[PDB]
Design a protein around this ligand. Structure first.
Ligand SMILES: [Ca+2]
Ligand SMILES: [Ca+2]
Ligand SMILES: [Ca+2]
Lengths: 217, 185, 189, 185, 217, 217
RNA sequence: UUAAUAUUUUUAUUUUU
RNA sequence: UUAAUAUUUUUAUUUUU
């Protein structure tokens, strides 16, 4: 690349599939300003779409991310390591957080995948794939790789301290009360397909800080 | 980080006194200010413009907020008008003009022009983010939970008059910042 | 002196249009660049696209001024989708829109394949110092104005052409990264 | 480039209220301000001096423009007087004193002296050049086309009184620049 | 010339005719700050006066200056090159513009020729040669050469962008709407003569800037 | 690459689609040896193939390239900018001219696309895709990109000056008379497909020289 | 860190290295 | 760029090199 102009008409190819391969990674622990630090990135969600209709899921941004131990659950997402670690602290605050879309399908699969963060749990959760993607949302074709979505969160200075809680118990909280335990939720909308297929995985890249020791769950 | 800033001034309340007794109403300080769609609601006041915009966002925080008293009565009007801000909703609401006006309150003669009351609120650095909701749904929740949705309330007390009359208007000069787009389909 | 009447700045991004293709022929839609973007109330209309959020806020003001504007194409179709999509902005409301997909792809247009993600188009618009103040108006009422008068209400229009497919399909979405300034409160009660 | 500067102050309107209901009139901001020579005028207000001069030029632009309320009633007069500027003519005109006074508006008690309202207008650098016409012909054109002839309109709302009385006068302090001589044969 | 005074009483001759000869000129094209620049000077009007009465013409200052395809149109003036060029752009703005009177008659011919620019099309167009010349106007004897009239226009900084349109269609516009397409109009008033004669030509010297590509008329 | 031999057996991949992206280009104007110069490249043709049979189109190489105002017209191709410019001159001559095939379909689409230039309009225009491609023609698979076809034309020294005319009127000329107005025509043959599809666009890269001012069309 | 724009009991927005 | 005059939520006017 240089400088002299032209008409700029970029040419390129395009695969049949965008491959990704996640090898063994080691989480990164660390002591901080009186805090415990943990930076890592794990797969929190599998997006299998149905032929019946579009699918809209919701993941609560909480340290002990797991699937509410009930029946007919209102949430998705499991962040194993992050959970285990966080289950030993009472307070947390985010430093870095972003969700990366890892495609697991051919460039042939049509439709779109949508990611959107909602700051307040008392916010009218959309039911339309079209209403969901209206704004503040990552939108792409299910086959595309390397795209990531970063929730608008205060991570500078000293963010507000949120309190850790257990997935199910959180699930049980009212809406005006979920605020004290979570930054917000990540709604994952994916269009339907001709037939049963796992569009891809949703990878959570993060850096949480936790404090206040706790016993057994 | 997504913030949208909006600074303006709107008249949010009309204060007409009854002859039965003294009138003490309260305006909840919320972006989506309107009067609750219920039967005989608790919260008074409405700010059409502000809310129309506030309806577009899920979170807000204040940078500047003051209230001005605009009289509509003659110099011959007696009694007083009282303005007082209450930070916590879990705080025992007055039922007397003399109790309401005890402290931290603007007190004047209904006919007096151009006075203003400025509530105590953090506007420095980065205040706490508040979730905004709709008037109705708000008045519908516990005082413990009201905090996360509003800075506090503005209690407006006013003397009763000889006969039914409009004492004046109550203006709100502000500047909020909001973020978190909502669906207005 | 002089009550708060100053501008209110608002910058954001929003998806304002879904492009689906027909088998009849190539499709040439047009989006009017207005704060209160929504589809006109009439049947067999001229303009497409709706910006719910922007509009709602726009409904509260009477005057708008553009400071930042660009459009990004977001595919929804497969890599095997033939033909191409085209973007071309027209600042003058009285310059007859082209009739052919081809001569719509001129020197000031962006042309690409439907499946290609990530490209964007930035129209040439004065945003320096203090552009011309434009008046806010509703979609329907707008599409009712005469071209000569449409000018005072909109910066320009974004034409969006797209090859016809073998069979009905959703090509993609069209996003709008903007930054408008508005003033002149209205009545929304 | 031909400009002629003129800065002055003239009283352009007399506000007398009726007892039937609240009065809401509007003054278009045009150099050649006078009341439409027609039956059933949409507009109100007249500025003899200013127009006499404005009749000599074809183009104008503003540098300074404010409006002062001069009361004519006693301290015992109730109600309020409302002043509000509207930038675009294609904007839904209020029909309620409470809707009109919602925002961006001077509001006071009819008897209150010396207050003023300053509209939002570009006076910096070189504002847009506006063509000036005659009151009548003006009120006679579409809202879309009204823009090219005027900055905006000043809507004046006022409470109804017990009995027919002159509330006060409305003064306009300005400084316009005009060019393009016309024939005054 | 020097300095020492005297009484200053200038003497001079005076021809029977002031000759002018316009040879082939080449228009000057050029790329600008994202604009297209064109500076040239062409003859836009022929002034033939009648014996019946005084003549008052009007030329709309527009890029595509030509005469309205209408039967008994109201606008005169044709600027060929400028039109062709500008018919490929949607927006224009003036940098330099003036009208020069090129006489084509003897110093014998009496009367006057009047040039005046009117900024707003909604301005009461005079009908009198006397009312026309009242002010803001170039006034001279038809025989005299080298005089030019410059319309008072903002040409500094960044003048307002006007929109290009086609002569006829423009002619069709209302008055409140002509403003968006033209700076103003040039009214050309010329007194009558003893008998059929072409007083002279009206030469338009200019420098327009245009942008926004357009197709076929 | 070096020198030492081997057996040379080149290996490589192959996309699903060859992408192209035409951003905003600025045409290049310029003054010359008394001529007017213009170099640019615009899309002059859209090739949509039918399922009924093979398609054979013809584009006349002329400055004012546009489709014939008519019914059941015979010449395709529209070159907007080039036309507008050229509609202001009476004479033209080519310096550089080539046609580039810009594919808009998957490497899956079969068949061929054929480009061939014919110097004399009085030449028996083929009806067969097979006869068309016999010789002097660019032939490729619809999916392939970056291939261009250059018409065999004298562009050195001082080529013959041809005369500008308007598309329709040209369409009207006899054959023995078309010669004076055009270098030749470009026949575009494209095989049919399983179903309605736009194989691609045909981009015209050029450098014409024009002279002799003209008025309105 | 710098440039632009908007508000003023305050910060928010866009761009550049 | 300079000199004069007029207005002040602003610029406009005339002259000189
Ligand atoms: Ca709570
Ligand atoms: Ca108009
Ligand atoms: Ca011949």
């Amino acid at each position: 690349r240089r400088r002299a102009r032209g008409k700029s008409v970029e040419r390129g190819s395009t695969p049949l599939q965008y491959v990704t391969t996640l090898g063994p990674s080691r989480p990164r622990m660390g002591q901080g300003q009186g805090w415990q630090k943990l930076s890592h990135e794990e797969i929190i969600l599998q997006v299998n779409s149905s032929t019946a209709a579009d699918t809209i899921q919701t993941i609560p941004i909480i340290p002990r991310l797991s699937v509410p131990a009930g029946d007919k659950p209102i949430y998705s997402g499991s962040a194993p390591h992050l959970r285990t670690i966080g289950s030993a602290f009472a307070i947390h605050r985010w430093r870095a957080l972003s969700f990366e879309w890892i495609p697991s399908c051919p460039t042939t699969t049509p439709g779109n995948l949508v990611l959107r963060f909602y700051p307040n749990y008392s916010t009218e959760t959309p039911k339309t794939l079209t209403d969901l993607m209206d704004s503040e949302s990552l939108v792409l074709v299910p086959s595309l790789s390397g795209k990531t979505y970063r929730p608008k969160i205060e991570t500078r200075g000293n963010p507000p301290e949120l309190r850790n809680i257990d997935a199910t118990a959180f699930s049980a909280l009212s809406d005006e009360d979920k605020g004290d335990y979570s930054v917000g939720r990540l709604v994952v909308g994916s269009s339907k397909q001709a037939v049963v297929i796992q569009l891809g995985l949703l990878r959570m890249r993060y850096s949480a800080e936790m404090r206040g020791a706790t016993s057994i769950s």
